[PDB]
Design a protein around this ligand. Structure first.
Ligand code: FMN
Ligand code: FMN
Ligand code: W7K
Ligand code: W7K
Lengths: 313, 313
């Protein structure tokens, strides 16, 4: 028994991959993720030019999860495109490239350049719709008209299947509106639910201080804190987008957590905080644990249980 | 060293109280909360007419928190008004009455009625804005136009200081907008942050099933899952509403968690999931734990550290 699957016209050894932003950023990180047992890897979300990011400390982790205000530190789009085009060994596993321009024009400029590398090499685009915006305006995924603009412009500029990285939603009418936007776009083939839960605040009692420097300590939450949020979003999109795949991300520390994501509807399962904390060895543990639970249940394939979470009466 | 507070023209032995919905719904519950060591109590959010609420099971708890889709089961306004007017012993502690009408007209009808009892007996109103409006629209506090409407009508109808119970927000633009709406209403003297984190989904791995019956398993989250969200919201409103009090609610299981709330800016601290799980003996434990932290740090009163939290740089 093995966990191999086929999606998006690619073959994957297993459904696991890093979450964007974790273990990705440099050529070394990417080489490390490729060497791991993961089924796939995604690069750090990038901007057209390189970015330092926000001041440090900007990440901290704790038993229940993590908080970050990284600020999109990245090597710039030319580096990630070069990685995709010249450096990555596609024979090892698929590559996704995450783009997170600060405007629609920036995203369009990057995707036009990605397109021929996607066609030639099969790199897959994940468009990050979870960046914050400037005072007086919510992030793009929380502004449905802007989101529709982004997706119209990218779909036209790119012209090939792609996916979108979504922030969590908390209200059923928002699930209905956001899924309806997404379903206007046939090139949107996967939806990754979820990004970090926005603008949490971790305080240390002993020091009486926030734990990260940027934004007066406010930053995105990941890890155990966010597992039921992540599962809700996975399942809500899985129900509303029958012609798309849903990729689960949030709160995965074990094969049991991966199992729950898949029961909710996840095709691939991304690991952020736990991978940052445990390192890439985690992927062999997750595979083993997921196969153990499958064996105890009598499941031979992921398809047997994906999306088959039971409701009560 | 002491936990005593004096706010809203009342005196409180300590900052702790139940969160609305927990251990409030019946006369029995209200007498129990009154007999406890809490500094205050709040009654179950009510509607004009009694409600049975949603089908069971509709609450479940786990090590990291709870999920609920109670559906506003309550004995109706007239009961809670009677409790406030005839049964509550104000010599023991102050009472808050929470309302959660299904429309702006329902809320106005109740606050019109409540006003003379508020004036005579000193019951305090908490208006629940994290509550349903028209189905297929977001809850009231995620629809800033509806939220302004509700506060305008209630302010006119009631004419006395009140407070509001808010859902959590996740986007700085939402903090800015929501706070600005609140600051339009001088009668809004306290803001309680936060209600449950909406539409989470808990899945049991062994049974492969959601754990509550309503809404295909989706419900609001409380407990350890939500503490950094709660803190962020307390602090965000504390900073943006300098002429209001902020009450904190979310993730309180210990005096340390309460301390963090208070450092974020909280003036009362409400206890939901942990109280549901441990019972009213929690209040003596939280009091002792909070006093211990104060003793170790040399703080003699709550005002010495309320809203202090340090930022980096
Ligand atoms: C340090 C760090 C950096 C991240 N950077 C990005 C990013 O560049 N792009 C992105 O889509 N998400 C980014 N995220 C979000 C993660 O991809 C993931 O959505 C979130 O951490 C929740 O998953 P988890 O519970 O496994 O951590 C980042 C998360 C962390 C912790
Ligand atoms: C069983 C249950 C019932 C609740 N009912 C209400 C309610 O009637 N009105 C309200 O404002 N909040 C209600 N809430 C939300 C709690 O007041 C509180 O905001 C939330 O549970 C977060 O606090 P916690 O982390 O201490 O549980 C309810 C919560 C629970 C668990
Ligand atoms: C406060 O200064 C900033 C500046 C840029 C930001 C960019 C993003 C998008 C990248 C990203 C980041 C990040 O690089 O901080 N962290 C996440 O948890 N998810 C993300 O998707 C972002 O995502 C939540 C937050 C950012 C915050
Ligand atoms: C039929 O589905 C319903 C019906 C009524 C609802 C009423 C509320 C408001 C009361 C409330 C409830 C509740 O009574 O269900 N639970 C919470 O965690 N916070 C609350 O404020 C509510 O709060 C989210 C959710 C409700 C869901």
């Amino acid at each position: 028994m093995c966990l191999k699957l086929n999606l998006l016209d690619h073959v994957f050894a297993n459904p696991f991959m890093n979450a964007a932003g974790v273990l990705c950023s440099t050529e070394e990180d990417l080489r490390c993720m490729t060497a791991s047992s993961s089924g796939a890897l995604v690069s750090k979300s990038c901007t057209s030019a390189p970015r330092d990011g926000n001041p440090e400390p900007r990440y901290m982790a704790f038993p229940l999860g993590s908080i970050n205000s990284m600020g999109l530190p990245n090597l710039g789009f030319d580096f990630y495109l070069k990685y995709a085009s010249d450096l990555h060994d596609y024979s090892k596993k698929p590559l996704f490239l995450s783009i997170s321009g600060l405007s629609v024009e920036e995203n369009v400029a990057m995707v036009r350049r990605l397109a021929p590398v996607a066609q030639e090499k099969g790199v897959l685009l994940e468009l990050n719709l979870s960046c914050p915006n400037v005072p007086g305006k919510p992030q793009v995924a929380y502004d449905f008209e802007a989101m529709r603009t982004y997706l119209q412009q990218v779909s036209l500029a790119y012209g090939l299947p792609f996916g979108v990285k979504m922030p969590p939603y908390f209200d059923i009418a928002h699930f209905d509106t956001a899924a309806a936007v997404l379903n206007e776009f046939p090139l949107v083939k996967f939806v990754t639910c979820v990004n970090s839960v926005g603008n949490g605040l971790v305080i240390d009692a002993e020091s009486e201080s926030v734990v990260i420097k940027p934004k007066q300590g406010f930053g995105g939450l990941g890890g155990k804190y966010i597992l039921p949020t992540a599962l809700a979003n996975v399942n809500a999109f899985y129900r509303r987008c029958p012609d798309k795949l849903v990729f689960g991300c949030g709160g995965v520390y074990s094969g049991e957590d991966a199992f729950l994501h898949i029961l909710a509807g996840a095709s691939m399962v991304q690991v952020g905080t736990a991978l940052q904390e445990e390192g890439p060895g985690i992927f062999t543990r997750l595979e083993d644990e997921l196969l153990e639970i499958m064996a105890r249940k009598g499941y031979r394939t992921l398809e047997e249980f994906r999306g088959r979470v039971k409701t009560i009466e």
